Design a protein around this ligand. Structure first.
Ligand SMILES: *[C@@H]1O[C@H](CO)[C@@H](O)[C@H](O)[C@H]1NC(C)=O
Ligand SMILES: *[C@@H]1O[C@H](CO)[C@@H](O)[C@H](O)[C@H]1NC(C)=O
Ligand SMILES: *[C@@H]1O[C@H](CO)[C@@H](O)[C@H](O)[C@H]1NC(C)=O
Ligand SMILES: *[C@@H]1O[C@H](CO)[C@@H](O)[C@H](O)[C@H]1NC(C)=O
Ligand SMILES: *[C@@H]1O[C@H](CO)[C@@H](O)[C@H](O)[C@H]1NC(C)=O
Ligand SMILES: *[C@@H]1O[C@H](CO)[C@@H](O)[C@H](O)[C@H]1NC(C)=O
Ligand SMILES: *[C@@H]1O[C@H](CO)[C@@H](O)[C@H](O)[C@H]1NC(C)=O
Ligand SMILES: *[C@@H]1O[C@H](CO)[C@@H](O)[C@H](O)[C@H]1NC(C)=O
Lengths: 113, 403, 186
C-alpha cells in the first residue's frame, strides 16, 4: 500500500491475507513552562500532539497545572487559546484566554454623548 | 457638476498568517537508525539553528494575527434593537442561531476556501476568538462611530453619523437628510449584490495554502531520493554491506537530506518575510480605514470613502469598503468672480455657475443651485486685475428691511 | 554559532589545520582539506543568507521610522493611530542606541454626559441645519455645541443655514430660533 506521500501505509499479511494499516506511533515534542528562576522553581511540562494532576488540552497533553473556571489575560501562551501563569501556596494554573472586559453601549434613536 | 450619486461596496482580501511548522531533524535525516545519529554528530548545532529559525517564524506568525485584530480593549455588544434608520445589517452581523458565532458572510467565505519528523502547531487564537474580535469591532463602528477608536465609546444615532461622514467628503448634510430612503435602499441592494457575487472571487488566500502544501509534499517526496548513492533505504545499506563501506553511502544520504532541509527552511523564511509585509499593510488598513474616515485617495477603495466593515476569513481578513461616486453631470458655464460695483466678489465655498440666463453659486460635488448673496461671498481686490469677470448684480439682505 | 562551527571535524581527522598539515604528507593532505573546506563554506553561506534577510527586515523598519519622523514631527498628522493613540497634537523625537524613540503627545476626552438630540429644527416652516455643531437639548431648551467639547450656545441665524422644507426630513422638532436682527430693529 501507499499514500500520496510515497510511503508505505498498508500491508497485507502473507500468512493469512488480511489488511493491516501502519500509523506512526507517539511522535511529538516536549516543552517546559516556567515563571522565572528569580521567583520560583516549580515548572510544568507540556507534550504537544500526544493523547495521554493531568489536564487535557487541544494543544496536546499538559502535566503540572490544574484547570480553573476563572478567566484572565494571557501571561504565558500555550496554544489554542490556553495560557498559564504563576500567581494563584502558589502553583502554576492553566486558564482559558479571555479577551477584554464586556461592555454595552446604550444606543437609542435620539441619544448622544 | 454632478447631480446624482450611488453607493457601492467592494471587497478586499489581505492574507495575514501562514501555517506554523516545526521539524525534528534527527527523525528526518536518520530516522530510527543508531549509527546514523552517531555519524551525524560531526556537524553539530545545525539542528539548533534550524529549530531556532522555525520557532522564530512561528512566533512571528502568531504575532501578526495578534496585531491585526486586537485593536480595542473593550468587547462591545450589539444592542437588541435592530432599528438603524433603514439600514439592514442582518447579513454581516453575528447570528446567534449558528453553533459558532460567525455571520453569514463569514460562513460563506469559510466554505469557499478549501508524518515523518514533521509537526504542525495550532494557532494561539482560535476561530471563535477572531470572530468575537470582528463582532466587537463591527458593533463599535455601528453604534459609536469613530469615538471608540480614541478613548471611551460615545453613542450617536446612525443617521447623524452618516451626515457627519458626508460632511467629510465635502457635501452638506441636507443632501443626506433629504434623501435618506434612497441611500438606505442603495446600500442594502449593494450588500445583497455582493453577497450573491461571493456565492460564485478569491485567489490570494488559496495561494498560501497551496504553496505550503506543495513545499511539504516536495520535502516528503525528496525523502526517497538516492542522492547518488546505491540505495535509498538505510536498512538495506546497513544490513547488506560491510560497515566500513556503508559509511560512504550514509554520508551521501545525510549530506543530501541536510541540503534539502536547508533549502526548505530558506524558502519558508523568504515567504514569511512577504507574509509579514502583507500583515503590516493589513494592520494599517484596519487601523485607518475602519476606525475613522480616510482622506487618502484610493487607499481604502475606489471613490470617496465612507466606512468599512472587517470580516474574518481563513488565514486572512476580508474587508467591505463603502464608497461614494458621482453619477450624472450636466454642462454649465462658469466664471471666476463677479464685478458688482467695481469690486470683485470671490465665492466663499462653492463655485459660480450659470443656467445660461442668470448666475448661481453651488457646492462642487452636488448640484444645489443657490441665489447669490453677500453672505455666501466675500469682497477683495479690484475689478481690473482679474483675468476673467462677468457683470451681474449682487443681492444684499440688509436692503429689504430698510422700510 | 559561526565561531562555534570551527570545532567540528566534518568527518576529517581533526578540526585544526596545523595538526593535519604536520601529520600527513601533501598527497594525502587534500582528502581532509576539501572535507573541511566544504563544511566551512556551507557555514559561511548560511551566515550570509541569514544576515541578508535580517538586514532586509531592518531596512523595512528603518523606512517606517523615517516616514513616522517625517509625518508626526514636522507637522500635525490627521491619520488615526499612526501618530500615537487618540487625537494627535505633536511628537518629540529622542535618540537611543541603534534605535529611535518618539513621544507622541495625544488628546483624549474624559467625561461624557447623557443628552437628547434631534437632526434638525423646524422654526417657521423652514428647516434649519447647524453649520458646524450639533443640536442638543437639556430637556427644557435646545442648544448648539461643537462636537468634541461641551459648550452650549443659543440657536441663531448665524449658526444654522436654511434649506429645504419641513416635510422631507425624518427627525425634526419644533423650537423658536433667536433672530439677532430683531433687537436691531429698535
Ligand atoms: C484519546 O484517546 C481516547 C481513547 O478512546 C479517546 O476517547 C479520546 O477522545 C482521545 N483524545 C484525543 C484528544 O485524541
Ligand atoms: C426611534 O426608534 C424608536 C424605536 O423604539 C421609535 O419608537 C421612535 O419613534 C423612533 N423615533 C424617531 C424620531 O425615529
Ligand atoms: C438618482 O438616481 C435614482 C436611481 O433610480 C433616481 O431614483 C433618482 O431620482 C435620481 N436623482 C434625481 C435627483 O433624480
Ligand atoms: C433585513 O434583510 C433580511 C434579508 O432578507 C430580512 O430578512 C429582514 O427582514 C430585513 N430587516 C428589516 C428590518 O427589514
Ligand atoms: C476663453 O477662450 C476664448 C477663445 O478665444 C477667448 O476668446 C476668451 O478671451 C477666453 N477667456 C478667458 C477668460 O481666458
Ligand atoms: C461691466 O460693467 C462695466 C461698467 O458699466 C463695463 O465697463 C464693462 O464693459 C462691463 N463688462 C462687460 C464684460 O461688458
Ligand atoms: C439618559 O437619560 C434618559 C432619560 O433622561 C434615560 O432614559 C437613560 O437611561 C439615560 N441613559 C443612561 C445610560 O442611563
Ligand atoms: C410643529 O408645529 C406644526 C404646526 O402646527 C405641527 O403640525 C407639528 O405637529 C409640530 N411638531 C411637533 C409638535 O412635534
Amino acid at each position: 500500500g501507499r499514500d500520496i506521500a510515497d510511503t508505505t501505509d498498508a500491508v497485507r499479511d502473507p500468512q493469512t491475507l488480511e489488511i493491516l494499516d501502519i500509523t506512526p506511533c507517539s511522535f511529538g515534542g516536549v516543552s517546559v513552562i516556567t515563571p522565572g528562576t528569580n521567583t520560583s522553581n516549580q515548572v510544568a511540562v507540556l507534550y504537544q500532539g500526544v493523547n495521554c494532576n493531568v489536564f487535557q488540552t487541544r494543544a496536546g497533553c499538559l502535566i503540572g497545572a490544574e484547570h480553573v473556571n476563572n478567566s484572565y489575560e494571557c501571561d504565558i501562551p500555550i496554544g489554542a487559546g490556553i495560557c498559564a501563569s504563576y500567581q494563584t501556596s502558589q502553583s502554576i494554573i492553566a486558564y482559558t484566554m479571555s479577551l477584554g472586559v464586556e461592555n454595552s453601549v446604550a444606543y437609542s434613536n435620539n441619544s448622544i454623548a | 457638476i454632478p447631480t446624482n450619486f450611488t453607493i457601492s461596496v467592494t471587497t478586499e482580501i489581505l492574507p495575514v498568517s501562514m501555517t506554523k511548522t516545526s521539524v525534528d531533524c534527527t527523525m528526518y535525516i536518520c530516522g530510527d537508525s543508531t549509527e546514523c545519529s552517531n555519524l551525524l554528530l560531526q556537524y553539530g548545532s545545525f539542528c539548533t539553528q534550524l529549530n531556532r529559525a522555525l520557532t522564530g517564524i512561528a512566533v512571528e506568525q502568531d504575532k501578526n494575527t495578534q496585531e491585526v485584530f486586537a485593536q480595542v480593549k473593550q468587547i462591545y455588544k450589539t444592542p437588541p434593537i435592530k432599528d438603524f434608520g433603514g439600514f439592514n445589517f442582518s447579513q454581516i452581523l453575528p447570528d446567534p442561531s449558528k453553533p459558532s458565532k460567525r455571520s453569514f458572510i463569514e460562513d460563506l467565505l469559510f466554505n469557499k476556501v478549501t508524518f515523518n519528523g514533521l509537526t504542525v502547531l495550532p494557532p494561539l487564537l482560535t476561530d471563535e476568538m477572531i470572530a468575537q474580535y470582528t463582532s466587537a469591532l463591527l458593533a463599535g463602528t455601528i453604534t459609536s462611530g469613530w469615538t471608540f477608536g480614541a478613548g471611551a465609546a460615545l453613542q450617536i444615532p446612525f443617521a447623524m453619523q452618516m451626515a457627519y461622514r458626508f460632511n467629510g467628503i465635502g457635501v452638506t448634510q441636507n443632501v443626506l437628510y433629504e434623501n435618506q430612503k434612497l441611500i438606505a435602499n442603495q446600500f442594502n441592494s449593494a450588500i445583497g449584490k455582493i453577497q450573491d457575487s461571493l456565492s460564485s472571487a478569491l485567489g490570494k488566500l488559496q495561494d498560501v495554502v497551496n504553496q505550503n502544501a506543495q513545499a511539504l509534499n516536495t520535502l516528503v517526496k525528496q525523502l526517497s531520493s538516492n542522492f547518488g548513492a546505491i540505495s535509498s533505504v538505510l536498512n538495506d545499506i546497513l544490513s547488506r554491506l560491510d560497515p566500513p563501506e556503508a559509511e560512504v553511502q550514509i554520508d551521501r544520504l545525510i549530506t543530501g537530506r541536510l541540503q534539502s532541509l536547508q533549502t526548505y527552511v530558506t524558502q519558508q523564511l523568504i515567504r514569511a518575510a512577504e507574509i509579514r509585509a502583507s500583515a503590516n499593510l493589513a494592520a494599517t488598513k484596519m487601523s485607518e480605514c475602519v476606525l475613522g474616515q480616510s482622506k487618502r485617495v484610493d487607499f481604502c477603495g475606489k471613490g470617496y470613502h465612507l466606512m468599512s466593515f472587517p470580516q474574518s476569513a481563513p488565514h486572512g481578513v476580508v474587508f467591505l469598503h463603502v464608497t461614494y461616486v458621482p453619477a450624472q453631470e450636466k454642462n454649465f458655464t462658469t466664471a471666476p468672480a463677479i464685478c458688482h460695483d467695481g469690486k470683485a466678489h470671490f465665492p466663499r465655498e462653492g463655485v459660480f455657475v450659470s443656467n445660461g440666463t442668470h448666475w448661481f453659486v453651488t457646492q462642487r460635488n452636488f448640484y444645489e443651485p443657490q441665489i447669490i448673496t453677500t453672505d455666501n461671498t466675500f469682497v477683495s481686490g479690484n475689478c481690473d486685475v482679474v483675468i476673467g469677470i462677468v457683470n451681474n448684480t449682487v443681492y444684499d439682505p440688509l436692503q429689504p428691511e430698510l422700510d
